[PDB]
Design a protein around this ligand. Sequence first.
Ligand SMILES: N[C@@H](CCC(=O)N[C@@H](CS)C(=O)NCC(=O)O)C(=O)O
Length: 220
Amino acid sequence: KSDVKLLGAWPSPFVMRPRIALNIKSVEYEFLEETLGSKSQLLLESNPVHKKTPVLIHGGKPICESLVIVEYIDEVWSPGPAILPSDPYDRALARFWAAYLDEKWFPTMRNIAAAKDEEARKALIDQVGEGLVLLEDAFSKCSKGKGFFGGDQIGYLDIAFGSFLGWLRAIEKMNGVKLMDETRTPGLLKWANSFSSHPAVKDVFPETEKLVEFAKVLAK
Ligand SMILES: N[C@@H](CCC(=O)N[C@@H](CS)C(=O)NCC(=O)O)C(=O)O
């Protein structure tokens, strides 16, 4: 257990990602929580560039950046189920969409909370909605009618996108908007249950109300 350590704030969509990947690979690990109010020495020494989590420590050796960590886990524990797609083009598409999520979509939805007016706030909600339209189409293309972005089995892009699901639901609730519905994102609605119910996910997947109540705690 001790030769695999995961440094992580909790709850966090980025920290969830390697927990799921480690679950898929049936890998034994110790979870070292970063607590509010302080950055640990281990953190400051493991991730001096960004001073954030997750950090996977594999043999006293730090791997930073959640998506990089998921690929590392997939490559090292190659015995287990595959996380990335096997085909180069499918892998490129999965990486493209995970990058879009982290660079454009999630930052936009995280900015809703800080908008300075109702005008600008709905502008962001509309963009988050449009992004979900794009992701619904990506899901159709990636899944091929099977259950996940990865196809029959959960995959890299399921982990990247699904890790945000609890925060999407909390932002939906606290803004009184419905961004996933059966009209605009029918496939994602179904996948959201497939993902949250998955045995590699369900025990690390946040209750929506908990995230809402937690958002309220952070307001400081
Ligand atoms: N982009 C990073 C995640 C960045 C991030 O914002 N991490 C926060 C989420 S709460 C965190 O827990 N950082 C550790 C800390 O602040 O103590 C990744 O993909 O690895």
